Amino acid sequence: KMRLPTRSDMICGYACLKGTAAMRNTKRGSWYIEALAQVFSERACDMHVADMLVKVNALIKDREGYAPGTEFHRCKEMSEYCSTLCRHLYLFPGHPPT
Amino acid sequence: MQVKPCTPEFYQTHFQLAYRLQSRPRGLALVLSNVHFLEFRSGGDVDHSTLVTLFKLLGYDVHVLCDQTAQEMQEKLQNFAQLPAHRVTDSCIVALLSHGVEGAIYGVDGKLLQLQEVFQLFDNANCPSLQNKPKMFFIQACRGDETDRGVDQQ
Amino acid sequence: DVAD
């Protein structure tokens, strides 16, 4: 029969890149979760998960740190995702309807 | 927060080439946040609330853990991966929010849980109930102390 | 903004 590798069908979103710091706002929270919640709530209806994490990458790339008089003023971050998925991942929210 | 529902037509034209994703609930989701330790993670409570709300609105049954030691995280992730519910759901979600270094995250006791050990809990050998089912992980944690200064735009 |  068909067997499986030990590990497959995972996708992992990371707030930042290897070697680097992820950024968090003291009031709005983390940049990455803020972006992920905006994108997912808005595009889960018509975009697969890996493509939504691309949209999140776009938002993270354009953001910059606001923290005058520290090493974080105007600092940057880049999110990434790694994938062993084997199909489109659509969440199909609210289908079928009540 | 609101989650716009897909249309029936979008479902009909996309479900054949996608993972099956129609169970109610769509899966279990676990949101594990560490905030008090490695400075206090101010705003960490906003992230936690936001994800709990997000995942419920996406049709997940959400479990939450707050301020756990590295050992507690490992034990509890293992308990979550072994829940029977996974056999009748179509997917799974695990979000971990904490301080970290590359490849690991911190428990509130300042000890480290390796991410490979986490992924292993959910793999095809340890979690046969999720075999062939999409498993999402979102890791909000540093992967190093290097602050990115940014570059000009040429 | 601060670091995680």
XYZ file of all heavy atoms in Angstrom, chain B residues 46-131, unseen atoms left out:
664
model
N -3.460 41.184 24.027
C -4.186 41.527 22.792
C -4.043 40.413 21.751
O -5.012 40.082 21.108
C -3.720 42.842 22.175
C -4.603 43.213 20.949
C -3.815 43.968 23.219
N -2.828 39.867 21.583
C -2.560 38.796 20.628
C -3.365 37.555 20.948
O -4.009 36.968 20.070
C -1.105 38.367 20.693
C -0.136 39.425 20.146
O -0.581 40.428 19.510
O 1.076 39.203 20.381
N -3.307 37.170 22.216
C -4.036 36.034 22.686
C -5.574 36.170 22.392
O -6.160 35.295 21.755
C -3.718 35.851 24.174
C -4.430 34.690 24.795
N -3.835 33.450 24.936
C -5.713 34.554 25.233
C -4.714 32.609 25.464
N -5.857 33.253 25.652
N -6.211 37.260 22.831
C -7.651 37.527 22.576
C -7.975 37.526 21.113
O -9.025 37.087 20.702
C -8.069 38.944 23.081
O -8.022 39.001 24.480
N -7.096 38.135 20.337
C -7.353 38.280 18.935
C -7.371 36.906 18.274
O -8.272 36.626 17.493
C -6.297 39.187 18.306
O -6.607 40.503 18.709
C -6.340 39.115 16.789
N -6.419 36.048 18.642
C -6.360 34.740 18.010
C -7.528 33.814 18.453
O -8.088 33.091 17.645
C -5.020 34.079 18.275
C -3.840 34.560 17.477
C -2.654 33.636 17.779
C -4.139 34.668 15.928
N -7.885 33.865 19.725
C -9.009 33.121 20.231
C -10.239 33.492 19.493
O -10.964 32.613 19.032
C -9.189 33.356 21.766
C -10.529 32.774 22.312
C -8.043 32.721 22.456
N -10.489 34.793 19.361
C -11.624 35.250 18.606
C -11.512 34.798 17.137
O -12.456 34.227 16.596
C -11.730 36.776 18.679
O -12.049 37.116 20.015
C -12.853 37.311 17.752
N -10.360 35.017 16.514
C -10.197 34.658 15.115
C -10.541 33.183 14.860
O -11.341 32.862 13.968
C -8.775 34.978 14.611
C -8.469 34.485 13.191
C -9.351 35.202 12.097
C -6.995 34.725 12.930
N -9.948 32.300 15.652
C -10.080 30.886 15.435
C -11.486 30.358 15.708
O -11.941 29.460 14.990
C -9.041 30.125 16.249
C -7.606 30.397 15.817
C -6.547 30.284 16.741
C -7.320 30.739 14.481
C -5.233 30.508 16.343
C -6.006 30.973 14.057
C -4.952 30.853 14.976
N -12.184 30.901 16.710
C -13.590 30.562 16.905
C -14.447 30.954 15.704
O -15.302 30.191 15.241
C -14.155 31.236 18.123
C -13.525 30.849 19.462
C -14.323 31.628 20.578
C -13.868 31.337 21.998
N -14.343 30.034 22.514
N -14.181 32.137 15.167
C -14.925 32.673 14.013
C -14.626 31.862 12.746
O -15.460 31.773 11.863
C -14.626 34.164 13.835
C -15.249 35.132 14.873
C -14.862 36.578 14.553
C -16.764 35.092 14.979
N -13.459 31.230 12.691
C -13.114 30.353 11.583
C -13.702 28.916 11.790
O -13.496 28.040 10.963
C -11.566 30.327 11.404
C -10.926 31.593 10.817
C -9.388 31.485 10.842
C -11.350 31.809 9.345
N -14.420 28.683 12.900
C -15.114 27.389 13.123
C -14.250 26.395 13.913
O -14.512 25.198 13.857
N -13.217 26.856 14.627
C -12.375 25.941 15.413
C -12.890 25.852 16.871
O -13.472 26.820 17.400
C -10.864 26.348 15.333
C -10.290 26.005 13.970
C -10.547 26.796 12.862
C -9.572 24.825 13.766
C -10.101 26.422 11.581
C -9.088 24.487 12.495
C -9.387 25.277 11.428
O -8.946 24.910 10.194
N -12.686 24.725 17.527
C -12.881 24.685 18.985
C -11.534 24.994 19.666
O -10.541 24.275 19.518
C -13.460 23.335 19.464
C -15.002 23.197 19.164
O -15.714 24.243 18.973
O -15.504 22.033 19.160
N -11.518 26.075 20.424
C -10.294 26.642 20.855
C -9.924 26.278 22.290
O -10.702 26.457 23.190
C -10.395 28.155 20.708
C -9.120 28.779 21.176
C -10.634 28.496 19.251
N -8.714 25.796 22.505
C -8.203 25.587 23.840
C -7.135 26.621 24.095
O -6.432 27.030 23.184
C -7.530 24.245 23.893
C -8.442 23.122 23.590
N -8.486 21.992 24.364
C -9.374 22.958 22.622
C -9.408 21.172 23.885
N -9.965 21.735 22.831
N -6.979 27.030 25.328
C -6.064 28.099 25.633
C -5.218 27.650 26.765
O -5.702 26.943 27.621
C -6.785 29.430 26.036
C -7.780 29.883 24.933
C -7.544 29.215 27.304
N -3.947 28.066 26.751
C -3.026 27.904 27.875
C -2.235 29.197 28.038
O -1.817 29.791 27.052
C -2.034 26.769 27.620
C -2.631 25.362 27.687
C -1.681 24.319 27.103
C -3.160 24.910 29.117
N -2.040 29.616 29.277
C -1.366 30.842 29.583
C -0.228 30.568 30.554
O -0.399 29.755 31.486
C -2.343 31.822 30.216
S -3.616 32.339 29.048
N 0.911 31.236 30.328
C 2.027 31.285 31.291
C 2.440 29.902 31.817
O 2.337 29.610 33.038
C 1.753 32.287 32.445
C 1.797 33.771 31.972
O 2.602 34.143 31.081
O 0.983 34.576 32.463
N 2.935 29.069 30.899
C 3.358 27.713 31.184
C 4.901 27.529 31.121
O 5.608 28.150 30.309
C 2.730 26.763 30.140
C 1.187 26.831 30.028
C 0.526 26.241 31.250
O 0.603 25.055 31.449
N -0.069 27.078 32.108
N 5.414 26.622 31.940
C 6.831 26.306 31.974
C 7.139 25.474 30.735
O 6.230 24.920 30.095
C 7.171 25.444 33.213
O 6.386 24.243 33.180
C 6.845 26.162 34.534
N 8.408 25.354 30.388
C 8.756 24.554 29.227
C 8.204 23.125 29.331
O 7.809 22.509 28.319
C 10.279 24.510 29.017
N 8.216 22.594 30.549
C 7.812 21.204 30.752
C 6.294 21.049 30.651
O 5.834 20.126 30.009
C 8.345 20.665 32.087
C 8.053 19.179 32.399
C 8.361 18.839 33.880
O 9.435 19.180 34.408
N 7.415 18.180 34.548
N 5.551 21.939 31.304
C 4.130 22.065 31.104
C 3.722 22.211 29.634
O 2.726 21.651 29.259
C 3.577 23.268 31.902
C 3.646 23.131 33.452
C 3.105 24.370 34.155
O 3.591 25.513 33.907
O 2.153 24.206 34.956
N 4.466 22.977 28.824
C 4.110 23.174 27.410
C 4.207 21.872 26.667
O 3.293 21.511 25.929
C 4.999 24.221 26.708
C 4.825 25.618 27.271
S 5.631 26.892 26.288
C 7.296 26.468 26.506
N 5.301 21.149 26.920
C 5.559 19.864 26.280
C 4.483 18.811 26.645
O 3.939 18.171 25.747
C 6.963 19.347 26.621
C 7.450 18.168 25.765
C 6.697 16.844 26.096
O 6.415 16.549 27.274
N 6.381 16.051 25.061
N 4.193 18.659 27.946
C 3.157 17.774 28.433
C 1.759 18.139 27.860
O 1.025 17.284 27.417
C 3.127 17.804 29.995
C 4.407 17.226 30.595
C 4.533 17.271 32.136
O 3.802 18.044 32.865
O 5.415 16.511 32.612
N 1.417 19.408 27.875
C 0.123 19.833 27.422
C -0.069 19.800 25.896
O -1.192 19.542 25.432
C -0.283 21.158 28.109
C -0.477 20.878 29.643
C -0.931 22.099 30.433
C -0.626 21.997 31.989
N -1.036 23.290 32.692
N 1.014 20.012 25.140
C 0.985 19.904 23.685
C 0.822 18.449 23.319
O 0.045 18.070 22.415
C 2.278 20.419 23.070
C 2.316 21.914 22.977
C 3.759 22.393 22.889
C 1.457 22.376 21.761
N 1.499 17.613 24.086
C 1.338 16.193 23.895
C -0.123 15.749 24.182
O -0.672 15.014 23.379
C 2.367 15.379 24.684
C 2.263 13.882 24.331
C 3.311 13.038 25.048
O 3.603 13.249 26.222
N 3.890 12.095 24.341
N -0.734 16.221 25.285
C -2.134 15.904 25.618
C -3.056 16.379 24.508
O -3.930 15.642 24.078
C -2.595 16.521 26.959
C -1.870 15.911 28.191
O -1.782 16.552 29.276
N -1.340 14.675 28.030
N -2.837 17.596 24.027
C -3.651 18.152 22.945
C -3.531 17.310 21.649
O -4.511 17.032 20.984
C -3.271 19.627 22.731
C -4.022 20.310 21.613
C -5.281 20.894 21.836
C -3.456 20.391 20.337
C -5.958 21.517 20.804
C -4.117 21.010 19.320
C -5.395 21.591 19.550
N -2.324 16.868 21.311
C -2.133 16.129 20.088
C -2.829 14.755 20.155
O -3.257 14.186 19.102
C -0.620 15.984 19.810
N -2.966 14.237 21.386
C -3.540 12.906 21.593
C -5.100 12.939 21.788
O -5.713 11.895 22.011
C -2.863 12.193 22.792
C -1.410 11.715 22.567
C -1.188 10.994 21.194
O -1.845 10.009 20.877
N -0.236 11.494 20.403
N -5.719 14.125 21.771
C -7.170 14.169 21.960
C -7.834 13.332 20.853
O -7.398 13.364 19.705
C -7.745 15.614 22.012
C -7.340 16.495 23.233
C -7.830 17.989 23.132
C -7.772 15.896 24.598
N -8.878 12.552 21.218
C -9.684 11.782 20.250
C -10.406 12.627 19.228
O -10.731 12.105 18.155
C -10.738 11.060 21.112
C -10.620 11.594 22.449
C -9.425 12.527 22.578
N -10.682 13.884 19.532
C -11.415 14.704 18.614
C -10.749 14.777 17.249
O -11.451 14.896 16.232
C -11.631 16.084 19.175
N -9.406 14.679 17.211
C -8.702 14.805 15.947
C -9.129 13.831 14.863
O -8.971 14.132 13.690
C -7.174 14.806 16.120
C -6.665 15.913 16.987
N -6.848 17.252 16.683
C -5.992 15.885 18.164
C -6.299 18.000 17.628
N -5.793 17.197 18.548
N -9.650 12.663 15.225
C -10.096 11.702 14.200
C -11.303 12.172 13.414
O -11.464 11.800 12.257
C -10.496 10.371 14.795
C -9.524 9.291 14.587
C -10.119 7.948 14.997
N -10.870 7.405 13.864
C -10.268 6.850 12.799
N -8.934 6.749 12.779
N -10.985 6.359 11.790
N -12.152 12.961 14.026
C -13.359 13.448 13.305
C -13.270 14.897 12.823
O -14.146 15.370 12.147
C -14.712 13.191 14.091
C -14.946 11.674 14.244
C -14.708 13.886 15.476
N -12.190 15.583 13.117
C -11.956 16.893 12.509
C -11.134 16.846 11.196
O -10.502 15.819 10.870
C -11.331 17.799 13.521
O -10.029 17.277 13.864
C -12.232 17.858 14.802
N -11.148 17.930 10.423
C -10.445 17.908 9.179
C -9.078 18.594 9.194
O -8.326 18.494 8.198
C -11.324 18.490 8.091
C -12.428 17.516 7.651
O -12.266 16.314 7.899
O -13.446 17.952 7.059
N -8.759 19.293 10.287
C -7.544 20.098 10.391
C -7.194 20.396 11.854
O -7.938 20.044 12.740
C -7.723 21.417 9.655
O -8.651 22.236 10.324
N -6.058 21.042 12.086
C -5.604 21.364 13.408
C -4.823 22.679 13.398
O -4.114 22.966 12.436
C -4.693 20.254 13.910
S -4.073 20.448 15.602
N -4.916 23.430 14.501
C -4.182 24.690 14.661
C -3.479 24.793 16.032
O -4.084 24.495 17.082
C -5.113 25.945 14.472
C -5.753 25.991 13.062
C -4.371 27.268 14.825
C -6.693 27.214 12.815
N -2.214 25.228 16.009
C -1.453 25.455 17.195
C -0.721 26.807 17.017
O 0.087 26.971 16.063
C -0.366 24.361 17.415
C 0.509 24.733 18.597
C -0.978 23.018 17.689
N -1.016 27.767 17.910
C -0.310 29.019 17.943
C 0.423 29.065 19.274
O -0.160 28.799 20.315
C -1.258 30.183 17.797
N 1.706 29.406 19.218
C 2.574 29.549 20.371
C 3.100 30.964 20.370
O 3.629 31.410 19.358
C 3.752 28.600 20.242
C 3.519 27.114 19.854
C 4.839 26.393 19.716
C 2.659 26.389 20.924
N 2.920 31.685 21.485
C 3.305 33.073 21.573
C 4.146 33.234 22.814
O 3.668 32.973 23.937
C 2.076 33.931 21.676
C 1.114 33.721 20.475
C 0.175 32.645 20.806
C 0.326 34.954 20.214
N 5.404 33.631 22.630
C 6.321 33.690 23.744
C 7.648 34.332 23.323
O 7.756 34.857 22.202
C 6.599 32.290 24.281
O 7.308 32.372 25.499
N 8.652 34.295 24.221
C 10.001 34.691 23.807
C 10.541 33.435 23.233
O 9.986 32.342 23.471
C 10.885 35.150 24.966
C 10.553 36.518 25.493
N 10.560 37.642 24.694
C 10.209 36.939 26.734
C 10.233 38.699 25.421
N 10.023 38.298 26.664
N 11.613 33.571 22.455
C 12.282 32.425 21.905
C 13.658 32.725 21.339
O 14.132 33.857 21.356
N 14.307 31.680 20.832
C 15.557 31.781 20.111
C 15.283 30.943 18.889
O 14.164 30.381 18.729
C 16.717 31.076 20.871
C 17.164 31.900 22.080
C 16.269 29.633 21.300
N 16.290 30.802 18.045
C 16.085 30.099 16.793
C 15.827 28.613 17.090
O 16.595 27.986 17.845
C 17.337 30.249 15.908
C 17.434 29.219 14.769
C 16.268 29.323 13.742
O 15.489 30.306 13.765
O 16.113 28.415 12.896
N 14.768 28.054 16.494
C 14.362 26.703 16.779
C 13.736 26.355 18.132
O 13.413 25.198 18.363
N 13.550 27.306 19.051
C 12.930 26.943 20.328
C 12.147 28.110 20.886
O 12.420 29.248 20.555
C 13.984 26.505 21.288
N 11.224 27.844 21.799
C 10.563 28.928 22.506
C 10.724 28.762 24.019
O 10.953 27.659 24.491
C 9.047 29.030 22.125
C 8.304 27.719 22.386
C 8.906 29.347 20.621
C 6.814 27.970 22.494
N 10.580 29.847 24.771
C 10.699 29.816 26.238
C 9.400 29.515 26.989
O 8.324 29.999 26.592
C 11.182 31.183 26.717
C 12.645 31.407 26.540
C 13.108 32.348 25.638
C 13.603 30.684 27.313
C 14.503 32.593 25.490
C 14.999 30.927 27.164
C 15.415 31.892 26.248
O 16.749 32.153 26.049
N 9.529 28.735 28.077
C 8.509 28.556 29.123
C 8.742 29.716 30.054
O 9.822 30.349 30.009
N 7.758 30.018 30.881
C 7.852 31.122 31.838
C 9.008 30.953 32.855
O 9.399 31.912 33.560
C 6.485 31.364 32.540
C 5.384 31.711 31.459
C 6.089 30.159 33.438
N 9.570 29.745 32.932
C 10.680 29.499 33.868
C 12.043 29.779 33.220
O 13.080 29.443 33.755
C 10.657 28.036 34.353
C 10.627 27.031 33.194
O 10.259 27.437 32.055
O 10.973 25.848 33.399
N 12.033 30.319 32.013
C 13.279 30.616 31.320
C 13.912 29.390 30.718
O 15.050 29.454 30.310
N 13.183 28.263 30.637
C 13.717 27.126 29.882
C 13.085 26.960 28.517
O 12.040 27.529 28.228
C 13.621 25.819 30.656
C 14.242 25.898 32.041
C 14.521 24.500 32.619
C 15.193 24.647 34.034
N 14.473 23.889 35.118
N 13.748 26.167 27.680
C 13.466 26.119 26.252
C 12.801 24.849 25.841
O 13.186 23.766 26.297
C 14.757 26.225 25.452
C 15.273 27.658 25.266
C 16.738 27.603 24.731
C 14.348 28.520 24.396
N 11.802 24.993 24.979
C 11.156 23.895 24.296
C 11.531 23.946 22.822
O 11.292 24.932 22.133
C 9.624 23.966 24.468
C 8.747 22.901 23.753
C 9.221 21.474 24.019
C 7.279 23.013 24.048
N 12.105 22.865 22.329
C 12.526 22.826 20.932
C 11.317 22.657 19.948
O 10.442 21.820 20.140
C 13.631 21.761 20.710
C 14.873 21.900 21.602
C 15.741 23.089 21.187
O 16.042 23.265 20.016
N 16.131 23.907 22.144
N 11.295 23.467 18.894
C 10.191 23.431 17.925
C 10.080 22.103 17.202
O 8.977 21.634 16.972
C 10.220 24.619 16.938
C 9.910 25.994 17.599
C 9.826 27.150 16.568
C 8.639 25.931 18.451
N 11.203 21.482 16.891
C 11.195 20.133 16.349
C 10.439 19.166 17.250
O 9.727 18.324 16.754
C 12.619 19.581 16.120
C 13.330 20.211 14.939
C 12.476 20.157 13.663
O 12.145 19.077 13.205
N 12.113 21.338 13.099
N 10.585 19.286 18.557
C 9.850 18.416 19.468
C 8.371 18.662 19.391
O 7.607 17.732 19.406
C 10.340 18.613 20.911
N 7.970 19.922 19.278
C 6.586 20.275 19.041
C 6.052 19.668 17.753
O 4.985 19.016 17.766
C 6.369 21.797 18.950
C 4.908 22.059 18.579
C 6.735 22.487 20.251
N 6.749 19.891 16.629
C 6.212 19.407 15.355
C 6.103 17.877 15.429
O 5.195 17.267 14.872
C 7.067 19.857 14.135
C 7.217 21.349 14.019
C 8.463 21.929 13.761
C 6.112 22.177 14.188
C 8.578 23.302 13.660
C 6.218 23.559 14.116
C 7.439 24.136 13.841
N 7.037 17.258 16.132
C 7.045 15.808 16.197
C 5.749 15.252 16.834
O 5.282 14.212 16.444
C 8.244 15.398 17.017
C 8.628 13.955 17.000
C 10.090 13.776 17.503
O 10.469 14.328 18.545
N 10.898 13.020 16.759
N 5.221 15.948 17.834
C 4.019 15.547 18.536
C 2.844 15.323 17.586
O 1.982 14.441 17.848
C 3.664 16.602 19.602
C 4.580 16.591 20.856
C 4.216 17.733 21.855
C 4.637 15.168 21.594
N 2.848 16.073 16.471
C 1.754 16.153 15.513
C 2.004 15.445 14.206
O 1.160 15.496 13.324
C 1.441 17.599 15.225
C 0.935 18.321 16.428
C 1.827 18.942 17.300
C -0.431 18.335 16.720
C 1.377 19.577 18.422
C -0.902 18.966 17.850
C -0.015 19.564 18.715
N 3.127 14.726 14.113
C 3.543 14.079 12.887
C 2.794 12.740 12.603
O 1.948 12.291 13.382
C 5.079 13.977 12.848
C 5.657 12.773 13.610
O 4.929 11.806 13.960
O 6.904 12.784 13.836
N 3.051 12.156 11.455
C 2.302 10.980 11.026
C 2.511 9.742 11.896
O 1.621 8.925 11.989
C 2.604 10.649 9.560
C 2.178 11.748 8.632
O 1.148 12.411 8.857
N 2.972 11.998 7.605
N 3.670 9.628 12.542
C 3.907 8.516 13.450
C 3.273 8.764 14.816
O 2.615 7.881 15.310
C 5.450 8.220 13.603
N 3.459 9.941 15.431
C 2.882 10.194 16.766
C 1.391 10.571 16.810
O 0.735 10.359 17.825
C 3.770 11.227 17.493
C 5.223 10.728 17.575
O 5.476 9.654 18.155
N 6.134 11.400 16.889
N 0.862 11.147 15.727
C -0.520 11.630 15.740
C -1.219 11.030 14.523
O -1.576 11.741 13.603
C -0.575 13.165 15.682
S -2.214 13.878 15.955
N -1.373 9.709 14.495
C -2.051 9.091 13.346
C -3.442 9.666 13.072
O -3.895 9.633 11.930
C -2.170 7.607 13.726
C -1.896 7.546 15.233
C -1.016 8.725 15.542
N -4.113 10.206 14.077
C -5.444 10.768 13.812
C -5.416 11.964 12.860
O -6.434 12.231 12.219
C -6.118 11.178 15.109
O -6.417 10.012 15.877
N -4.282 12.699 12.793
C -4.188 13.797 11.845
C -3.484 13.456 10.517
O -3.160 14.349 9.728
C -3.573 15.046 12.506
C -4.359 15.734 13.617
C -3.505 16.795 14.297
C -5.689 16.374 13.096
N -3.256 12.180 10.240
C -2.533 11.807 8.996
C -3.196 12.358 7.766
O -4.372 12.173 7.610
C -2.388 10.292 8.852
C -1.253 9.702 9.689
C -1.181 8.166 9.598
O -2.017 7.513 8.953
N -0.198 7.594 10.253
